[PDB]
Write a protein that binds this ligand. Structure first.
Ligand SMILES: Cc1cc2nc3c(=O)[nH]c(=O)nc-3n(C[C@H](O)[C@H](O)[C@H](O)COP(=O)(O)OP(=O)(O)OC[C@H]3O[C@@H](n4cnc5c(N)ncnc54)[C@H](O)[C@@H]3O)c2cc1C
Ligand SMILES: [Cl-]
Length: 468
């Protein structure tokens, strides 16, 4: 009994659908895109052209909702990369010492991740994916949503899809503001922090011996410097490839051409390591760019009126500058927040509002982490009432940098920093007396003076051909 309609069948839509089918009799997923039968790019998820990191915090939730998915990804060529043992990272504060594993991430093409999650989700016969379908309107009124009116793209026929619960997971281009406007509801407060970040990506075939057991490599901006922030990330993915994504804020955006890409990876960022490694590899694709990098949040949970049976989650409610890599994990946390309110409240009145408030809490750490680091770049454009961003940003950055600095050279501080940065723990965890204690104890290793690559890692950058 009871039925749910999910708008958007991307990451949040698939995750929330898998959860919902354990609580309602049927789930219908409505998407305007066409869906490939295999792990291919598609127009509805254009960000899949760029490096995607699935931090442990999100990965564990994906596993809970769709168990066996992590192993299926690894079996398809995804990499499990330990953090910080599997990363060579020139942070704002210097090189990260590669301490033993504290957290992890899963590294693969977003196309493969999306295909795997969708295939696992649709194993549940009571979830149906309705492709090539437009979302026209929410049915019902401002007091209660009762479904959606859709248009079939092939036939042009419009029809009404009844639902006890509608979940908007249509992503960064969600039309929910319009949909809610047509209901008569007031417009939500919108908050944004826009650093002008632009991403540029190329795929490379790695040297054959480095197709496995190769680290994540990153060169980060120094957000404390009053200069445009530029970054470079090299990430292993399936089938012996490296995805390389460079980025820059206003005044340091990467160029669009193949040659400028390589020079940006060498000279536009603070250390040339990513430039040096891609020179060992074979380029497979030309530069793809994205500017879908604004931190944008819609405070739907604070609206004066909220209709029963409507919930918005994923990028549709809060989307981030992706250099921090939180979007998919934040959506996963938001799904568990809805599940928690469903378990407590079932379908009583109050459910949708309670879930919307719970979702706002679930994305808040990801929101604070991304905006607090973006707000310092030259030229940043903002619209906010958040005192964390307007006033208390000065000391929040003073304590962030003490922890960030000490995390590069102290195993206990690093463990706590990466627990938070992978969304495996909340921000209160940093106020644990033991963590503040380790911070005060400071570095236990020297600061590396060169990239902390292993000899065996660099040895696999050449074939050894040409030698008798
Ligand atoms: C360049 C870039 C890099 C990123 N890197 C990372 C990273 O490293 N780690 C990470 O965790 N996140 C990353 N992200 C964020 C991540 O892509 C998103 O957070 C994630 O896709 C959110 O899922 P979603 O389901 O809300 O949206 P999406 O996955 O985009 O899915 C939206 C779905 O809704 C459909 N749709 C859209 N509009 C409509 C409509 N009007 N009607 C019907 N259907 C509609 C689309 O076709 C699609 O199927 C990155 C994003 C970008 C842009
Ligand atoms: Cl994009």
């Amino acid at each position: 009994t009871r039925s749910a309609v999910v708008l958007g069948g991307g990451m949040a839509g698939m995750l929330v659908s898998s959860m919902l089918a354990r609580h309602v009799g049927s789930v219908t997923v409505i998407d305007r895109d066409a869906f490939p039968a295999g792990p291919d790019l598609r127009k509805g998820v254009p960000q899949a052209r760029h490096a995607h990191i699935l931090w442990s915090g999100g990965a564990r939730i994906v596993e809970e909702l769709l168990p066996g998915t992590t192993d299926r990804l690894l079996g398809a060529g995804a990499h499990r990369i330990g953090i910080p043992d599997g990363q060579v990272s020139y942070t704002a504060y210097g090189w990260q010492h590669r301490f033993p594993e504290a957290q992890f991430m899963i590294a693969c093409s977003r196309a493969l991740l999306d295909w795997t999650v969708r295939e696992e989700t649709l194993r549940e016969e009571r979830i149906a994916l309705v492709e090539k379908t437009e979302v026209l309107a929410l049915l019902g009124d401002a007091g209660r949503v009762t479904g959606v009116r859709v248009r079939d793209q092939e036939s042009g026929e419009e029809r009404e899809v009844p639902a006890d619960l509608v979940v908007d997971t249509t992503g960064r281009g969600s039309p929910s503001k319009r949909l809610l406007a047509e209901l008569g509801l007031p417009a939500p407060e919108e908050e944004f922090v826009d650093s002008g970040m632009v991403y540029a990506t190329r795929l490379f075939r790695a040297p054959e011996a480095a197709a496995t057991n190769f680290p994540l490599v990153s060169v980060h901006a120094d957000h404390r410097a009053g200069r445009p922030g530029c970054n470079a990330v090299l990430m292993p993915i399936e089938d012996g490839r490296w995805i390389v994504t460079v980025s820059g804020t206003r005044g340091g955006e990467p160029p669009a051409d193949d040659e400028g890409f390589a020079r940006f990876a060498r000279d536009g960022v603070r250390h040339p390591l990513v430039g040096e490694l891609i020179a060992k590899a074979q380029p497979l694709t030309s530069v793809e760019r994205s500017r879908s990098t604004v931190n944008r949040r819609l405070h739907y949970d604070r609206l004066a009126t909220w209709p029963e049976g409507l919930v918005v989650l994923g990028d549709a409610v809060a989307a981030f500058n992706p250099v921090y890599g939180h979007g998919m994990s934040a959506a996963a946390h938001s799904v568990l927040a809805l599940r928690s309110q469903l378990g407590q409240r079932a379908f009583q009145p109050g459910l949708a509002r309670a879930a919307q408030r719970a979702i706002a809490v679930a994305v808040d750490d990801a929101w604070v982490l991304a905006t607090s680091h973006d707000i310092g770049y030259p030229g940043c454009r903002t619209q906010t009432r958040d005192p964390r961003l307007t006033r208390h940003a000065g000391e929040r950055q003073r304590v962030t940098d003490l922890v960030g600095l000490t995390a590069t050279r102290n195993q206990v501080v690093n463990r706590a920093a990466v627990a938070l940065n992978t969304l495996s723990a909340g921000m209160a965890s940093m106020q644990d007396p033991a963590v503040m204690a380790a911070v005060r104890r400071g570095p236990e290793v020297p600061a590396p003076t060169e990239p902390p690559l292993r000899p065996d890692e660099v040895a696999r950058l050449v074939s050894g051909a040409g030698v008798t």
